[PDB]
Structures are given as structure tokens and as C-alpha cells.
Amino acid sequence: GPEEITADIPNVGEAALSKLDESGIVYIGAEVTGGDILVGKVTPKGETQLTPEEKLLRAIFGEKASDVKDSSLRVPNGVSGTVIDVQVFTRDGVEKDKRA
Amino acid sequence: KPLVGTGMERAVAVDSGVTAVAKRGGVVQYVDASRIVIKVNEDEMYPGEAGIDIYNLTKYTRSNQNTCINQMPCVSLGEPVERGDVLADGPSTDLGELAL
Amino acid sequence: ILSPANGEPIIVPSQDVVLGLYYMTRDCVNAKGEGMVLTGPKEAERLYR
Amino acid sequence: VTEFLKPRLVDIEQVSSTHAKVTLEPLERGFGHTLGNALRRILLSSMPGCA
Amino acid sequence: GVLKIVKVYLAVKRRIQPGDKMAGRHGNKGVISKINPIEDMPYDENGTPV
Amino acid sequence: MNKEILAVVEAVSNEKALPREKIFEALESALATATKKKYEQEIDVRVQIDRKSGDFDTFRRWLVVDEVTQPTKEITLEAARYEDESLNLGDYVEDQIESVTFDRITTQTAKQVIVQKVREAERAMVVDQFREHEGEIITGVVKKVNRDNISLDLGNNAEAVILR
Amino acid sequence: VTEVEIDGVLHEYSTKEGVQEDILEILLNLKGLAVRVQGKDEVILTLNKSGIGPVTAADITHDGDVEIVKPQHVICHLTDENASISMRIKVQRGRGYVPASTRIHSEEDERPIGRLLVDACYSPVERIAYNVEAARVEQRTDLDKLVIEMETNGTIDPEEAIRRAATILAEQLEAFVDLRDVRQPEVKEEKPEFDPILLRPVDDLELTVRSANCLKAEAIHYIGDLVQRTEVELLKTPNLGKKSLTEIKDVLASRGLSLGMRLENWPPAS
Amino acid sequence: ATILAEQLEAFVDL
Description:
This is part of a larger assembly, with 3 copies of chain A, 1 copy of chain C (49 residues), 3 copies of chain D and 1 copy of chain F (164 residues).
Chain A: H1 15-18, E1 31-32, E2 37-39, E3 43-44, H2 52-55, H3 57-60, E4 68-69, E5 73-74, E6 81-90
Antiparallel strand pairs in A: 1-6, 2-5, 3-4
Chain C: H1 18-24, H2 41-48
Chain F: H1 2-11, H2 20-38, H3 104-132, E1 141-145, E2 150-153, E3 159-162
Antiparallel strand pairs in F: 1-2, 2-3
């Protein structure tokens, strides 16, 4: 399945999320420090469950919460700095982000 | 400006692209920190096309070596510039002179 | 301190320190204080400072 | 705060009973040289004695 | 097959500090070696430091 | 909301072993641990999701004992002299409500609880079914041989063992 | 100046339609500003301007104690017609010089994105020359009249600065005016075990004022004497629901302690 | 130290 840039992250706390907006991408001007997470994108992790009795559950209850894996983008540890801009390129069809 | 220069500053600055050279002379109708609006002199404009031109000065933007490039408008307001003059010093430039 | 290549001392004061000493251990003919007698190096040091 | 850091010395070494080596710590970022210089210029020249 | 390329920009204001590399215009390169305080530097007899 | 967990329990085709009562109590416990992971006030918040009436709603436990350890869930035998509690063991309240539900961690812990519970329930079902079959000749596939005793599988993850 | 915040700015690298200089140049100019404050040790000035003109120092909203030294100090140039700049400026007092990133204390300072951190460079003296000359004194010779010339920010007054520096020097000299073996190291300490929270009152915990008056009306002012307040000795309070009790359990106990512990260290000092 | 303090005496105010 394709990626998702949703602000929510299963494991990390709000502290590692507070710098983000509802769309995950950081506010323009938030002073980030090393290691911190800019985005904000989780990944489809699992496979080979093949339990329709749960797939059907997670077809309606967990199609969004099935195989999360937080392959976010974090600032490389060592470099600090202020964010001043966020460019966004979208694949048409997928509408836009609120930031976009 | 460097105190002891070799006179070559005018050429190396203007002949580069980093400085937003004024195309067609006129009066500075409206300056700003990022946008310049030059009302063309009454002659060097086509019959139609009131054509008050706009120079959009690129603000802080990445370099191919991660150095900010910022053009601040070195010109005042209401002053008249001729064709091919300097209107915004590029990165590490002053008054249209290479200022390293 | 002795380079294994040649037994000459590898740690030699090269520059910016040799100049210092060479200037110090020099002799202007008629400089301020010529002709005195000093009761020891510390004495002359106090005199110069 | 405009309230400085006064030193808390650690040693007064008295080799030879007439040749002392005092240490002081810490001083301001530049006070070391200023106090040393003032004290030296005073002791060398302006110090009443007898000879 | 890429949906949302999000580029983020980061601006760091790197001040000068020991270790940096400075050079005149005559190949006299060198490394900045100490941020000496303003007063300790030599100064002309009219007060202006160097 | 009530629509969410309604869909949850109803979409469960094996509601036989998983009726709405025990299912919704298990979901109460799931949301309990979910908010406890959200909050830092680690208090066992039994939900009472209002099985068929309404949406979710949270509580607060108080672990009646002479120990004030973790006072966030401590109100002792009679350290509740307000509101005319009239309680001797279990003096709890709904002091706070409205803990988020559409997040990731709630759905993940709910899924985990549901899978655990459905497997346990259908295991109990099959065990009782074979209890009906007791005293008969039941086939099955062996699972693993051990020198002292053998583990055989009967299908539906039904296990049996045969001793020395 | 040590801190600024403008309305439209989100980071010092931005622009603002209407002002000629960029934000960074405004920061540099602000740093160049010179001001004296008298009573307090920090203050929040405000500058509001609208319309074309060179926005300079004197056009700020001065208070009674803050005092700009030179008005024509140019801050920026409002060049568009209906351009508006409204900024707040935290101006503090200190000693010496301090850069920006070295001022980091917590994360709440950077929490408001509008926060901009100019590196404070406050040192009222800019250049200090001196020289001696022969003083034609009452009756002696080679007495040296010393002359000190100072180029300063008009912040500090000459005699004021001289006497402040002389006090600093005399005190720092007094440190060894009677030097000795004052060497510091010691061992075998006996420390009052109680945590300093106990000395502090309830309002030193960020609690709701309602529960504050509640524990007032239930004989609780210190914190070493609310730990000497059994758990039954709290909820009896007039009108404790859960919220005031929430604050109580939060800022008294949940921060590490209990809602009343049978302790016997307090009082070791009260 | 004492001689320099006596030098300064006419300046400090504490």
C-alpha cells in the first residue's frame, strides 16, 4: 500500500508530536533540534496475516490501523536549525494536504 | 564593499545573475523587502501594455552548497534608475559590487 | 625527540619562537641601560620589566 | 547580575621559605591578567622598603 | 510511484568560532585560533583596538 | 462512538461465543489501558461504554486500602467524607471523561484484545464441544512427539496429550 | 535588547510586505539600539507604527523608567502606504556579553513561534583610551594626572561607570588583600533531609486557587504541614469535587509525594 | 594589595 503523511504516530508521544500540525508537517518557524521528527509519515508494516475474520474487522476498524510502521523523517542527529519553508509535491488524484 | 578592490567588481557582479539588474529604466514606484515595482519611463514601453514591471527578489533559498542566497533591495524609493542598473544586490554583493 | 631516521632532534623550535629569542639575545650598541652592573639574572629581569 | 566570582584559592606553596608560589581560582574571564599585571607593576616599583 | 514529496528547509546561523578557516586574498590561509576578548587585543594609542 | 463499537460487535460473525456483554466489557478494559497509556494518572478506568444506549464514557478507580501508594487511584475506607459516598470498598467516580478514540493506539489495543478474546472464546467452545464428544473415538493429527508424552492436534487448534 | 517578537514574523529569516529592510536587518538594527533602564532589571517595550516613514527609536511607546538615549536610531523603513508594524521587545539587564543559543533554558521560551532571539551585546563602553601626563601639583613633581577618554553608548554616565569599575576592582582585589589558606574542600556533611517543596506553600506548585482557599479553610499553608495531613483530612473540605482534588493530588502527590504521609522529619527547622 | 586599596579608596562607596 502507498504511504501516508498523517500526523498521528502510534508509539511516539505528544512531545515528539507537539511540533507538528494536524497534517504532521512542522509549522513554518518551529525551532527544531537534532533527532526530532519533521514528519510524520508512517508505513504499511505487516503481511501474511490472512485472517479475513480479522481483516474484515480491520477492513472497517483497522484499514487505517493495520500495519503501521513509523518510518518518519527525523532531522539527522547533530544539526539544529530553524525551519523556514516547506515545499510539497503531490501526486495528482490524491487531492492535497491542508498544508499543500 | 572591499576597500582595496581592482575595479572588476562592477563587471563580475552585473554580468553574473545573482544581482537583479533593472531591465528597462524608470521610477521606483514601490519597493519592499521582497518585491520591487518599477513604473517604466514614458518612452521605452510599447504603445499598449502599461507594463509596470515587477522584480520578484528570491528570498532565502538553498544553494548547491547549502548557502543562503538573499537579495535585498539596495535601491531607495522614488529614485529613478536607467536601463541596466542594479536594483537588488545578490548574495555577498553591495551596491552592485562584488563584496566577498 | 630523536627522529628514528636520523638521530638529530626532531623537536626543533621552528619559527615564531626562534625569532623571539634571536631578538632577545641581540645587542644594540647604545640602548637604555648600557654599562650597569647586575646582581643576578632575576635582577636584570626586574630591571627590564 | 553584576555580582562577580571571587576566587577560592587552593594552595600557598612555600618552597625555600622565601620563594613562594601562590595560586588563585577562579577569576573572571579577563581578571587574571589584570590583577597579575597590576600586582607586578606595583611590587616591582612601588613597594616601600630599604636598601 | 511517489505521492507526497515533502521537502523541509532548515536555516542554521553558524557564528564564527575557533577552528574555522579564514584567508585573505593572497593565499595567506589560516585557522582562527582563539576568540580573544576585546580588551586583551592590542590597541592603538587612541583606544581603538585591532 | 456507539456506532463504532456497535459495528465492532455486530460485524463479529462469531457473536455466539462473543456476545455484546463480555465483548463490551473487554472493550472497556481495552480503553482503560489505552487511556492509562495516554494519561500518566495510571488509574484503572473501567468504561461502561453504555453497550446499546450511548457513546463511551470514562470512570476513575480508587483502590481502597490504607496505602496512599499511587494516590491518583487512592481513596481509602472513609477518606471520601464528601457527597455522602456510603461506600466500604470500591469508592470510584467518573471524575473525567472523553478520552480520544479515533487515534492509532486505541485501535491497536482494541484489535489485540479482540483477537485474544475471540481465540480464547472459540477455544473454550471447541473444548466444550469435545467434552460432548467425550468417551468416543476421536481422530486427529499429531503435533509433536516427546519421549514421555505426545502432543496431538484435533483441528480448530484443539490440543490433546497422551502420557507415558 | 535581548528578545523581540513581531506580529507577522514566524522566524527571523522571513519577510514582511511593507517594510524595506528584511527581518534580519531589523534584528541587527535592534541590537544596535542603545537604552537605559533604571528601576527594574527587565522590561517589555512596544513599538507600533503605520504609514510610510523611517521607523526610528523615539517612535516606540516608552514607559516611565525606560529611556532611549538617541531618537534618530533607524529601526526600519515602512515603505508601503498601509504597512503596519507592531512589535514587543523584551529588554533586560545583565553583565558582559552572551550569544543567542547559549540562553537556552527550557522549551517554553521557543514555544511561541513569534519568539526571536537577538544575541544580547550589552557593554555600554565602546572604546576606552587613557594616557598620563605631568601634573603641575601643589608642591611636588612627576605626579601623574591620568586622563581617561571613553566613547560609550550614552547608556552609562562617566563618573557612574568609573565608580562601578572601581568598586568591582577593589572588591576583587579584597579577595586576597588578606590571602590565606582559605582552601574550600570539606567532607562529612549532615543535611536536612526534607525536600525544599515542604518549606514552600501550596501556590508554589501551580494549583487551582479554589483548592488553595480550600486547604486554607482546612488548615494547610505550608507543604511540610500538608504532608502531616491524613487522607481523610483532605476531602472533608468545603466543596471538593474532583477537580480541586485533581490539582491537590497532582501538584502535591502525583509529582512524587503522597497525599499525606506520616513523616517525622518536619519540623527540623520550623 | 593594601597599597592599591589605599590608592582606590577615594572612589569606592560601599
